[PDB]
């Protein structure tokens, strides 16, 4: 249904936009392609209008992208990364006011298969 998980332990103060999405999730990772998943934030603070995702190397914004998703999607496949490389995927939420906090989780590309089996 719609449950939470533990209490929010982060600066809240006065804020309209939403907070950090559920939790970053990475699957079907490869050498230059990985899937990103998350959940709905408990600080919806309104009716989510969408989610702003942004993937980028460990410390290389130059390799950052800006994508947009609806308030129905919470996962997206990333592509154009690097094999055996550290990356950071930031997933933010967008409301009728704007974008709020962002969940950035460090993830290092899986590994390049370089052909089937080995070849």
Curated annotation (Swiss-Prot):
Compartment(s) of residence: Cell membrane; Synapse
Domain of life: Eukaryota
Chain's gene name: SDK2
Stated name of the protein: Protein sidekick-2
Record text on subunit structure and interactions: Homodimer; mediates homophilic interactions to promote cell adhesion. Interacts (via PDZ-binding motif) with MAGI1, MAGI2, DLG2, DLG3 and DLG4.
Domain comment (free text): The PDZ-binding motif mediates interaction with PDZ domain-containing proteins MAGI1, MAGI2, DLG2, DLG3 and DLG4 and is required for is required for synaptic localization in photoreceptors.
Positions of glycan attachment: 59, 71
Functional description taken from the UniProt entry: Adhesion molecule that promotes lamina-specific synaptic connections in the retina and is specifically required for the formation of neuronal circuits that detect motion. Acts by promoting formation of synapses between two specific retinal cell types: the retinal ganglion cells W3B-RGCs and the excitatory amacrine cells VG3-ACs. Formation of synapses between these two cells plays a key role in detection of motion. Promotes synaptic connectivity via homophilic interactions.
Residues of the full protein shown: 885 to 990 of 2172
High-level lineage: Eukaryota, Metazoa, Chordata, Craniata, Vertebrata
């Amino acid at each position: 249904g719609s449950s939470g998980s533990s209490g929010p332990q982060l600066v809240r103060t006065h804020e309209d936009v939403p907070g950090p999405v559920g939790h970053l999730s990475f699957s079907e990772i490869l050498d230059t392609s990985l899937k990103v998943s998350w959940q709905e934030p408990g600080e919806k603070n309104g009716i989510l209008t969408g989610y702003r995702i942004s993937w980028e190397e460990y410390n290389r914004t130059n390799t950052r992208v800006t994508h947009y998703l609806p308030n129905v999607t919470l996962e997206y496949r990333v592509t154009g990364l690097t094999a055996l490389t550290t990356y950071t995927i930031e997933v933010a939420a967008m409301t009728s006011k704007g974008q709020g906090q962002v969940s950035a989780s460090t993830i290092s590309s899986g590994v390049p298969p370089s052909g089937p089996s080995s070849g």
